[PDB]
Amino acid sequence: GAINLYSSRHYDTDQALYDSFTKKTGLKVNLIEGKGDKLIERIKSEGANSPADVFMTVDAGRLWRAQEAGILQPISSSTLNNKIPANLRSPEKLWFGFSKRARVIMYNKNKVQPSELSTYEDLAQNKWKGKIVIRSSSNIYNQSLIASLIEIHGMSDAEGWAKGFVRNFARPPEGNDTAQIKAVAAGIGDIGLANSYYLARLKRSSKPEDQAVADKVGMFFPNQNGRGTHVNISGGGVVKNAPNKEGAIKFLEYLVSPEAQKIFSEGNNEYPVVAGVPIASVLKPFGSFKNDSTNVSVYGKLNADAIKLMDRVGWK
Ligand SMILES: [Cl-]
């Protein structure tokens, strides 16, 4: 038989994972690609007629939106629950993380030493005036990080932080996460926020200009002396009306195997979720880091609050 995998998270190296799955289970993987938000809308519009078995995307904020659209069904699996850390899966078992990213401080190594960095909260301090670059508030990764800060601090204390943070922008938000790393390399900012895997992607590039940017920029995992670094997921779930629910479950279970964890995580320079699986060579030089134990569903729950806060403080 077969499963229909609707994914915004596919890389071509994942074909090896699909082929291994098929060898192990007999199930073919039919891949349907699209942007994550577009795939949610697609599955919603397909309704009860949808062939989708598995939905995969990035960011718990987006997985939460999927869940609230009613397109997922809950799955109880010993294998998923044992192998996936509780903080990286939906409390309601609607979706599950399969690789992990961190939203980190990217810094210009010539201008900034790691001893100068500490927490997310410290980024609102006046010493950083004119020195921070970050992308738009319309980006989900930012929404999820600010949601986490609202959960910790409450709206009033988080708004105080955000006002200071925005005050420190070197320029109006412009470009994607990679653009922020480039701006840090070029001296437009001294620090920026971006996901871990974008630095690794530059490190691995064959383009000399990308390598030169990676040579100039370090990454710092914040809040190590306190709650830990903000982590988020690439993840997925079984679709509400899946025509092959058993096969869908088998696929999710296969993704937590050590083989699949390596292939899937390394395909986008992300970290495994499963304990004991070795980390990608490109990530090792940055070291291990304490992860916050907050359940990542919170970042979806508070997504609208994050958007509102960012609007209120003038984060463009
Ligand atoms: Cl929590």
Residue numbers in the entry: 4 to 319
Paper text:
We have investigated the function and structure of Trichodesmium Tery_3377, an iron stress-induced protein (iron deficiency-induced A, IdiA) commonly used as an in situ marker of iron stress. Using heterologous expression in the model cyanobacteria Synechocystis PCC6803, we provide evidence that Tery_3377, a commonly used iron-limitation biomarker, is localized to the periplasm with a suggested FutA2 function as an iron-binding protein of an ABC transporter. The overall fold of Tery_3377 assumes a classic small molecule ABC transporter substrate-binding domain fold, with two domains hinged over a substrate-binding cleft. The hinge region is formed by two short β-strands and connects the protein domains via a double cross-over between the N (residues 34–133 and 266–349) and C termini (134–265). This type of structure places Tery_3377 among class IV iron-binding proteins (in keeping with Ref.
To try and crystalline ligand-free Tery_3377 to examine structural changes upon iron binding, we citrate-treated Tery_3377 protein preparations prior to crystallization; citrate is known to chelate iron and was added to remove all iron from the protein preparation. Additional support for the plasticity in the binding of Tery_3377 comes from the observation of bound citrate in the binding cleft, clearly indicating the potential for binding of organic compounds. It is interesting to speculate that binding of organic ligands together with iron may represent a mechanism of siderophore recognition.
